[model samples]
Target chain A: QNNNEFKIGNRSVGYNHEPLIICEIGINHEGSLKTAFEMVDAAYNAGAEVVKHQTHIVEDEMSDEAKQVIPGNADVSIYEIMERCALNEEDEIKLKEYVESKGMIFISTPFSRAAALRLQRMDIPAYKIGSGECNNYPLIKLVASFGKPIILSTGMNSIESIKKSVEIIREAGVPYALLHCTNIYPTPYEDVRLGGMNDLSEAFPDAIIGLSDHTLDNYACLGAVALGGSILERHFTDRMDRPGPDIVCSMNPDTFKELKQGAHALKLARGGKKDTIIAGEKPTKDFAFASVVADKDIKKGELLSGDNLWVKRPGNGDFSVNEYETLFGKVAACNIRKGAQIKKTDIE
Target chain B: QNNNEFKIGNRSVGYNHEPLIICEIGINHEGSLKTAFEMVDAAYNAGAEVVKHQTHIVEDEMSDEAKQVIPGNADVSIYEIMERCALNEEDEIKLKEYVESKGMIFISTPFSRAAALRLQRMDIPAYKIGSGECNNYPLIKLVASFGKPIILSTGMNSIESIKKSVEIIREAGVPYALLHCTNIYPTPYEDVRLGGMNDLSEAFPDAIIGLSDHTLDNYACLGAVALGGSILERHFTDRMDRPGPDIVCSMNPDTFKELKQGAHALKLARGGKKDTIIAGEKPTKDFAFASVVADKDIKKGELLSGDNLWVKRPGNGDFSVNEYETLFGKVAACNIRKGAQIKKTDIE
Candidate 1:
């Protein structure tokens, strides 16, 4: 069976429904439970249905080399940043409870065995695996074994590697989604590469596809929805002025509102074939379309010619503009008045 | 040959290039040649490459019945509105010259034989046909005979009716485009029906596809681009606070700028398969991905297990996280330090 649609919490996700917007408050709270809770409230007020956070067990996720490796987006070591930003187990539980209390879905990305185990223990409805974990087979299998819906980010990995990760999820027989992503913080428009979403669809047709954006704005997200992305993930902050590694790429309440409304509008405008005239547009046709009409007074036996017949509006006539040519050289069966519509029965 | 791409003046349009945005200043000038020139200037300043106007010869285009037929967007009769807004031939010549002087393409939709003849006399590079003209076969054939490119709008007409019109254009042997549209002024999101573009494509694969949006904003236009629309058209004005029947559905300079920039961004973000890692993303993978490493110090002869090994970052180690499961039950060939990346040679 095709797994194009599935439930994540109470929300159904697929092309049939409006795209689900994920406000990823990942590590933006700087280990402060109060900021995390406030961010959730801001997201909820902005009409967000789901908010995601990162689960980082710093000591278990990084080794000595990580402390020596500086990231391009920050001057500090990767390990130091995560160590400073990761919430404790107790604080994370409180943040999840606070998020759910507002009637929104709470999801998390776990970076290690300890982190994944903690999220599992908390019974997270779904797991959002970071782009770094796309090729981490051991971690992917472990997360999939938990039997929950997975939204995996495939940014730094290739389709060859992603196939293995997808295989693990398929073997686990759990609902999963793949989000096309570019790992650069505040990624440039060129690298946003929404074409990757199509690649995911083609490679894993059964998995629902989406975008995990790192761009500075929501234009890519809106474009993604147009291309049939049913899940949109972006870093989100309560305020743009806040200090964090992700704030540069984060969407504030105002832009988030635009994205939500624009996404819904795109979804509504996505499907429908123009095989027939829309009922709503029929009223417009009455005044807009042209019809065959008598250009001058014509005797009953006179042959139709350019001086006596032509096409003009209103379109509520016995003959339409399409029949204008056929009326040429035909005998007029009645005395048609100037500016009067030509009838089929009045012609021979 | 498949005719998915074509030239409108100097611009190239298709899926491989950025969408061509047509700013329809259609009667928003309401008969003022000066206002028409200013709107063209505004569209150019807003990064527009093309501006479209309506060519109406009221007497030739409508009959007495049109004088009695009122439109949904205005209280005045459709004939009266066009008669009031119709520019004289000399002034229409000046507007076209001025638009071309600003380095933009000037195109127009003709509403009658006289109107079409005037545009052809002006030596126009292309012609745009309004939605109501989709089924006006006589006029369609007349305009197609001019041998210029045609952009036909299909709104109130059904596929059966459109097919005949397409056949006329095809027989004329000129390049053509089809724009999916809804005739309603300020059409609601539901009525925009962008999927009509898809229907047009399926039924006539050779024609380049696009949208002639009548919605209040550019959201529908952006969505249409995502679905492979190579041309986008919307009513445009220099200022929104204007008196015209089409003002409610027109984009101003500011919104036009947004549409131009957003459309470019969407085109850039559009295609790319996730079959391989991007060259730009290689640097991030070094610090983000995990490698198999020792969790604690272990003796040379000690067996690898959860107590002695796990996966951690930075990922420059000999064995990656994917190899973590396979390393189980293997004996350590050398002493591994706590928090240190394990080399392939260190395990037996």
Candidate 2:
């Protein structure tokens, strides 16, 4: 949405601001501190503006009955998987410190009240609300009370339902953005739905917009940038061989590099008023633009007509094709030889 | 221009039609009948809807002064280059018949009066007006008089200048499309100016729009497809190592194959009405969507508040997060236990 550019952890990210590329290291570290360190370092090396993590306080986030529930992306029960992936509070604090020391924004998605409290205590500047939790008004209210910037991923919810969440964020006076997203893991290419950004744009014209990508390729995200996406998120990992459920949707070093560079290019190329040509194209315009020509010898004062006048190349002539209609029936001011380029001065 | 789909050698091309991929065999055959025949077969194998050639009767096309004038793309004189690349009437006729036998539309850019008349005599179904001839009203009038469909490549000329030429074709009452093009051979990626197509669409809403591409990459053209470009053109060469200026801009079999399939995919992937989620995303929606829950125990007739109500995963509950705000202060109809999934029926 169009607004005065806002800040996310000291970095401005909104209309005309450089897209904040958040490498979602996610749960791919597989509960290892060393693996998490490597991914964060890798993100820094690859020019990431922010590195995102998921903070789970298992029992606080889910009930005992949830141990039987398995998510579509992973075969393991949600509770057991989250419990295993949880880093101790002390270690999680250290990880945030490490990410900040490298001069990047450190943000995370908190799946429970306790987890959100943990990030708040960590003095986090912003919060990432996952697509699954976008409509979680209870959690949104808790987070909104913090009065910090929030990046909300809207994937499953329609514009109608999202309005309530938006109303809450705005009423709280917290800076926020809605990330156009799809919930499918490694979402099918067509379903990436870049046009969804346009829908979001129209629906929430005052809020900032971004895209949380889950595709095997980067085409849809680039299209998203062209369609006014200002922040881009993709599951990212240092190694595709890391063996995790999310790696199938993660981008490695090389593609991530392209995504970064491409975002800058497409953002700059995105929109322009189309009534006229840009000034940069003048050199090509001179040599290629066409002009009226004398098809045959015409005596001075003779009327210009279809039979004696034509159009030809080497365009820097006095009369452009725009003036062709006016030039018709106008008297020739001077003798023009056959095949000569005609000029405005030669016509009355 | 948005209109009902029109035909180019029986291939439908318009706003919603399958994009017709033209493998521009342009001067890439290097003036040999054998090479031209092989190029035609290669384009056919590459899944091209049409194969285009450059037909030039050098004497009819250029003045004697052009014998000494060097063109920017080549060091040699324009007359000398076209003379060498010119396929004679007998060989060109054979090449056209041979291309037709391969079951593809055979078309060419005819640069002169004699050359266009020759193609007309050959009973060509359509005529391609190159960017150089876009302002060449004499030839346009001649080709339009033939009462056949015309594919006009509008480059070099601005919208103000293009109207006259567009008016001529419209008055002729023949089906026509404008192929937004850049005259530069092997055009730089940024300079391709696919946005020029937007200008054309707004300026001439009745004509179908396409791209006569000169870029070494397919990115711009694909973006064109996403932006509603209905037909696409790219130079084609069976061999890149073949010595010629045009070879640098030509797409080999593999890229052309990608262009055809890629266009179909991007076109299919384009445009969404954006009010609600698609039916296919519903399974993902249900599994990922979150719902309101009792954060703690609330006895029967207890009023709901932040102390008792929150949100959690697996959205198939009696009430979704959309109802979170409205449920505040509602009397509980049942004894909702701690961390229990709440139901609309239990709330008054």
Candidate 3:
């Protein structure tokens, strides 16, 4: 239980409480500061606790020749797309300030050392390490050194790589959460591998476990919460039809709202301590159990038999029929009317 | 790993293999033997290995007074409804024959001693024990005496009750499988408690584990499979609007078909073994990772620097820009042309 308690913004996450929902606005801005600000507002309205973005210093991260090799889409390299979609230092500061204005935590994933340094100035609450950088040790160390809580996405990495990256973060003295991810665009249901969260929880019992979901719907997110994920980060865009690299795989406002609802419901349903028997007739039990009662009238000292006894409910507080054998063939010490509950006091 | 292996029909069930799909027909017959026969055919077409039904001697199971307490337009006691739905001795023979014609196994839940004795004559492949009957010692002992494999549904029962029932079956020398279930009709997603299956596996290491799902959608069934459930049992109906107790909780043909597809996809995705290392250059991976190469022609004994070396991919060898650190700042032992991969042998 000690491992369950951790911090996210001003909230304390634990097995005894609700799951934390993080709405990721990763590069869905379409290169407009106005659009980025609007996303933070939308995420806040949809009940998200945090509004997240991506920070990438494309020029410093990719060499000019390496950029040239990136496949051209209508004569546009992926590097150009990244540059067009990424926000500058001033814009990031503005976005974070706007997000904080709406009572939401601002978080971002830094893809380069320069981006990490710039994001540090924005004073974002935490870092979300994207799945593609699970093996980027230098970047991991750089972000961890900032001393903020980190949520690491393990999309394309293997178990061994994940262990190494996590160890690197732990050694840097940063509290981190591990998210199970699959690096597929609009990841198919078959590859979600939500069970990997259980593996991670067992492997790194000291760290909080979470999910960075790219699956098509909200079911996987709900499943993650049920599997004991304390943090949930999912991509969000204004519209599915938007023309951007991340938009196609991101959820629209309506879907994000549903995901938030589901996450809360899953947390509530997991409920309090395990193994404690809940009292009261849970409608289901009412229909499934039989109650012991008298099938006919009996004078004093009469014996009970199959013909004189039956099981009914709410009709009489008779014997518990679930303990039927113990009540069979017992002699009645007093008179009992037909349809009366066969209480233990009636027998000697 | 050996403990993970368990059998259901012709297939092995575990994390190490594909799960078995059990289609439960469960009184969706609308009190008609013809409808029950059709359901068997539909289940077989849906690729179900086992088709399960419920056997109840309604009159013997319920008192006449209890039968008289029916409510509303669905004015029928549990006994009358079950009696009407029950297949007679001759019809039971025909039902078994029809299932065999499709090469599928026939299974059913017996709700009373008479029904159990009757089903014993049919030679069912397995006897399914309902959740309500978990604490029914007489019923449990009777079913255990049959000496056939039992699939016990643990819905309303506590862990202690489940263990007690399993002990009874074990003492009777019967092999059993424990199915984690929630008795609620059209079970809500949160009430699933899927981790209970893992607990059951740990508690009865010798028994197989399964899921008796009442969840509204088929997606939960797929998740159950991923969580190491050896068998999945879902109620199926021809129509959701039919006038029966279970119709509202059952999946129509279309949803059942989708469930089958989802379960199959999850099984195929599990593939081979855990902790596997697949080595190959998938086209997608090539597009994601950068490769190391010469920026310009370099003579022997020349030192590699940021300007002399760059990372690009598809360089006609295993070498890539991703290995930059391993080759950086080292002297080139041989001449390398522009765009040529910088190999370890080339750099000393």
Candidate 4:
């Protein structure tokens, strides 16, 4: 199947090249514009190309019953939590401006139609659908109609639902990426269905595939790069001590740095096409192959055998020890001194 | 193709299972038996199933010329360094006994033919071919002749060389595992060549595959586990401050503990057969599906229309959102309350 090469800002991404690394800030700001700005700076310094966040229109999105169903022991309602964590429209504008200043693209997931319109007005580079909204058809339709690229998270949805959502978006003519995610708070390692990316890629060959990771460590994010994921979205927070629904699952600055480095490194390791030799691999052949060396002084026309031949390094001859079985009884055509690398010119 | 499942001590490993984590304690002992024993304890506590050491006949393995090649800027010769770091025969026996006491397997990479014979006499569980000796054909043949399982590191060798080496060992009837490795002092992440494991596995369908990581961080090792590796071998040091060749490239106890946790978590994440839906995935079908629901109050025998009907969740009916288009303009059998999930029996 032909895959379209796409871009996240200026970086071209597809199965044919290295996976793109997207650092997700995702409302770890806890509603503070200053904290959000700092997170964007940190992500950029850590070598991330895109800094992502979450936008929610709290009042329109939650019902009173749904808000009241919030766990009694927990300190906040869905409305209160979103209100306390989300950046204001003006602040979001500033956040995006700050991200752009750092030479990174600013991206965010919009939870409501209002939020989508607001983000669109702010000129967000793209739109994202969270796992919780994977089946929200109206919102999906609304976002797709905006005519920008979209990232759809499929954590709490089935393969069938994912197919339907992709069809809906594709029919609307929006370029999109599907993120294989598991909707668990601090998702169990068993729940990180990485193979699902391959499954999704095969099913929707035209769309870019990415990861919305909730695992506690960075290794899976790194593994995603090797598995052909073009975008990696992870939760980010300034401190693990911060109290929020996502903070416990978010990576602090140090771990985020490691994730950034590891993902880039994995993409680099995948390198270019199969069977081609790379530069770093050159020294190994020199160090690993044994060279045919004369073990004793030999006059012209002498036959080479176990007593007269041995193998050493600095492979200066045409044949290496690998050819030992083939060259064992060959006759010498010229005089050879002890410790000389054997060549075909000296053998008949 | 059918794959052979191999056993390491009590653990069975193959393509379908998690990788076995091997922590290389190498010469981190700093010439002290007591410290070596403590390191063994730490390895067991850190969740390692096997703790590996280096067995070297320093003098036999290196020549005066080779020794001189090591810049005198260093405090010790390669021989002197290994000699000081290695355990004696008595200590080796004692260390193995201690490892057994902790219910852990003891493994060692023998550097010379003499060292191999020594470990063979001790009846070690397996043999490892270090990166430095990937092409030492005589040593490989000697090690293979022991009729034991082997793990060969192909750190600096080409695919062709690795194939030849494997052929040489297989000729002697040795069952082997191939590890993708890079021999750099502290291998750059890009140099890992992780895809090579898949290449090796595909090329030698009978052989197991793994990674021998030299990167300073554990993410690469864990990534390998997630990607279906059967074994993971990494260098470990008792202390980063310990003076030795491997110290700079090796993980200390704290990092090894983290690596163990990361590896185990990745293994656990790569759980079971594909397509078997689990608990976390159940919500997708329940909450993420769209079901036909009354968008507004409808009188008895009224026709459903775009404005009066919509798709919502809590699908308690036979008709889902998929049939929304099919049900348009269909007559309702009875008066339906607003927001009620629809069923086929509710409509004609």
Candidate 5:
């Protein structure tokens, strides 16, 4: 049997656990180690358990064609932007050490063989595979070789493409989560496509399911949690006044706190699959629910009818309104005083 | 074959429709017809499609003991509270007509037979049964007798209690909905058992499922929507500054607007069960996804080697990274220049 549960460092990711929140710093640090450290501190202060970064070895991850390609949200070419934002190995190690010292798990998405190897050397507890690599079979196999839990993002790809990558992970015998995502930066709420989580759960039964959202707020993430998202990933920044392409979609400390609180509440609210009279509701039920009562004084042998009996408040009686209809036409066994509850003995 | 979909005064209530937002006035008007009218106007302005009220013929709904019973949130007896807040039948009719005149569906919950009869006399199109009446089988049978659609709230009652009432409605042959609810006034977020909707669906497969939330905000309601709640009912007021028992739990115009907009977005974001390459994602995929490319200049008949072939951007090539591993050791059929995409004809 497949367990849709796994460990990323010490934190658990599964329907049984509080939805694991991954506040992705990604490239939002703007290549500054100080900014990255500050962002990690902000995440910790906001009660976040995990922080993710992007491992961009630009020289190996992109070629000449990427130098000519500009992103929809950026003025510079994709390669040039990555080149500017790629942190050196020394700084990345420091940032990871800083995050771990604060008692937070640090995970990163590696964009190439070199990046993947570096994360392996750093001994990252898990790997987050970005959407662009959903079909990059070679990279997936390479990352799987590390045998760490993988959280793979399926964006701009079909179930057929996702299946290939999932097979590779399964073959490696590693715990994994599939996060439904939209590659559009600052994804439109209408295109968030939360239903994909359900599809992913069904298509990959053993894999934990979640969402990698780019929406502006925590609403979609809350919705995703209700639908069994075990891992929620969103871009993060320490402050909104920063200059970066992902900043528009990145959540700051306040919004990140809201997501954490709202998701926790949602987890509490989920899984009472059937209505039960909870113990706390008994007090309210006493005065709110109704009982069958004598509407007027009834003498012995008088037939019980609507004119003499009715349903009334303070439902602490042997007979409730549920039995009201069964009492109609039954003879009154004794004289019942007006404003008194009708007992079973009163109806013959 | 039971359809879990139905109509409430021409408004569709089901997974296929935008969650039916029922803004409950529910004695929040404090017995003032003018305030009720204002609330209805605010609801319309906030883009509400339905408004619900509570009909309390206090004399018939409560017995003498109710005069001594105080609610957890109220200082006075439950009887006194209803006696003071219940609108006269004449004002309720006017309020219903005004709501209908504004092109909004008007619905109400009747607390007794006399109250239910008065609503029937008014020719209301549907019935909303409150949580207290979840097991009020006599009243449920009476209301279902009218053959109008009913939306029953399940709170302070178990699935067993609800089943008996549901049987009554089904036997009456009216379309119905079951709203999972918690009876506590200003219910704690932890008590908002959203998973009850799924249980209700399984137990009462033919009835539409929803939530009647008593929490202070729209977050729980949105989460409920994602969990298959087709209708969302919340206590509503024109302003939160008003004094009423339910005001603390009620949604004012601004919050109501947020509920309306957020629920609509959630509806749009729902139900794309499997992942697919949406048309708009193609442009991003072109640059983001990797393709097999020449790593260095190679002559014809040179064996395809790892040193000479790799994956890079501008994914418009004949072969992608998915095929990269399969090409090892194949003879190069043509001279491939460095920094150029590897084509099918370039390999044997």
Candidate 6:
């Protein structure tokens, strides 16, 4: 009853539609254009519907004060980490153009006004705001003003806080999707909390829902699809041997392909109604189903018993085994041989 | 709030508790006592809560007519298949004793009145009814009249028709769970229809819902757990290359172990209320969250602009990056060093 699908490049992305799989090659390239090239090619080869990049402008994204404070995973300060990992504006522009040339949807997350302005110049199809910026109303206001679709990741914030951000998106009347995310790198399985998507679903019915996965396995993503996540995202790298904090959580090309295939299968599996048996399976029903059959030789008017009555295979028989108990005491109307198919007409 | 768990032997079977995983051996033993012993021991080692068998009294369960009609997956009739696969009464008694000695609960599905009587004599904790007998009201009545618990597999029959069978079990005042099953050999993922369990959930709120999966993978079971299925059933064999139709879908010892671990993870992942951050994830929050920081050096009373302000991380700052926007264009209250963590107090 709800027309929730929105166009993402050529694909229709929505709750009821096929999954729009995104591979976030977010800084796993470590600022090398050559490595970024390999990932874009790997993700493209892996059949991703979208390739996401983190558009970081070092001067525009972090202050020098961030250089002194280190994060839990990496030895470097946040500013230095971004500086080491960020692709320069010129390199990213070339990367985006190459990604589009290969027939892939190229989009990026803007970490600051300067970075967002550079992406705005790129004529991107959508804005993917990272979870850290979910409550950044200024960016929401600025991104919405561009009139493109917004894909917002909500993490480290509650429904109460997200409401403020969601209200701003609605005011702009632009198409949008909200991704339920857990920000832990290599998140513990217990913290995966798939039920949070349920909260997002209830809180924003108008917005399509998705999951930004950081768990070690893709099983959680598959489960998320079963729970109605239309957009599935995870950071992906081509190889694990590379040295970087993200490489640990990032999926390789093989797993990426598996995730996409699995998600699409779940999307199809989730397509049908629960109340009816699939009509396609009816032909297999006949031989696989059980039927009442003669257990041994019996003359007309003989009562059915353990030695003479039983249920067997090939459901084409007129009588069902379900009637066997009540029919156990009834007289047979005609002569029946051993291994004879039972019919209602043969009963009195 | 709902108490959906039921007791089978010493173990509690329900949606609220850990998944009551049943490795349904179901004649996969191919009438061999040694194979049955191997499956029981393997399943016990694999952490199965219950080891299930199919009790088939050939003379009482199937008629000679079954010899003429072959099933879809086998070259022999259903009677021949079960006869070759079933364990004899003496052997079953020994197998049950052995299974219990291994600290595992042993349960069996009885296919006939005689079979049910045999199981009752064996002192089985509960009776599992195959999907084919779901509509067999007489058997349902007989099984329920035993005053034991019932686990009914619902396949081939519609929810409308299952209501009648469900009524008989409920009327008998015995604990029960309904397994949404697709009665196909090596069921395709599309036909798994795990969603149908939801229909059973809403329609018969008193009865626990589950899946008896014949699919080649355990993804359905994992998804079913997320959907609140209390019971998970799958066929088991020690070897995958076994020459049996059931073995095609039966998971070996390794896969059985994996399914148990995955289901338990989902059980933990399924816990907790949505919309709130997990208190344990708070440590990660401190560094992962973003904060406002100086993009460059700012002099005393200098106006903050795009060139002088941005958001970065090591989120232990006094103000969140979400506050970066409102602070823009404000006069700096004091001189700030390059890359300094921005504070609201430093602004006028």
DockQ of each: 0.63, 0.34, 0.15, 0.27, 0.59, 0.38
lDDT of residue B254 for candidate 4: 87
Model 5, span A1-348: residue lDDT tens? 134698987788898888989999999998999899999999999888999999998878877778888876787888889988889998999989999998999999988889999999999999999999989988899999899999999998889889999999999999899999988777887787787887788888998988998878887888998777888999999999999999999999999998888888887776655655576677688899898899899999999887788888878777788778778899988999987888878877
Give the least accurate 10-residue stretch of model 5 chain B, judged by summed lDDT. Answer: B271-280
| Between candidates 3 and 6, the TM-score winner | 6
lDDT of 2 by residue, B201-300 (tens): 8888888888888767676677677667888888898878886777888898888987777677766655564454656566555655666788888999
For candidate 1, report its TM-score: 0.92
lDDT of 4 by residue, A280-332 (tens): 65543443345667778999878888778766543335776667657777888
Candidate 6 lDDT, tens digit per residue, A194-281?
8888788888889888889888878778778877889988898988888787788888889998888778677755534456766645
What TM-score does chain B get in every candidate?
A: 0.91, 0.96, 0.80, 0.85, 0.93, 0.87
Task: Output the worst ten-in-a-row residue range by lDDT, candidate 2 chain B.
Answer: B63-72
C-alpha TM-score for every candidate: 0.92, 0.87, 0.74, 0.81, 0.91, 0.87
* Per-residue C-alpha lDDT of model 3 across residues A107-146, encoded as one tens digit per residue: 8887665788888877677788876666666567778888
Residue-pair clashes per prediction, in order, are 1, 0, 5, 1, 0, 4
Top model by TM-score, which number?
1
- The global C-alpha lDDT for each of the candidates, from Candidate 1 onward, is 0.87, 0.78, 0.69, 0.72, 0.87, 0.80
Task: Give the better candidate number (1 or 2) by TM-score.
Answer: 1
User: For model 6, what is the alpha-carbon lDDT of residue A277?
Assistant: 62
Docking level of model 4: acceptable
Best-first order by TM-score: 1, 5, 2, 6, 4, 3
Model 1: per-residue lDDT, tens digit, A1-348?
Answer: 134888898899987787999999998998888888888989999989999999998888888788888776889999889988999999999889989999988999999989999999999989999999899887888999999999999988888889999999999999899999998887888787777887788889898989999988988999888778899999999999989989999998999999999998888776666864567776589988889998899999999986678788788888888778788899988888887888887798
For candidate 4, list the clashing residue pairs, or say none.
A189-B269
Task: Write one digit per residue (lDDT tens) for candidate 4, span B1-348.
Answer: 135666766777666665677878787786788888877877877777888888866544543323333322244445466667877777787888888899998879987656888898888888898866777776788899888888888776667777777888889886788887876656776677667766777788888878898777776776777666778888876667776666787876688777767766766765233244657555334433446677789988999987787665433356766667677788989998886767767788
TM-score of chain A of each: 0.93, 0.95, 0.86, 0.79, 0.94, 0.86
Model 3 chain B weakest 10-residue run by lDDT: B272-281
Give the candidate order by descending lDDT: 1, 5, 6, 2, 4, 3
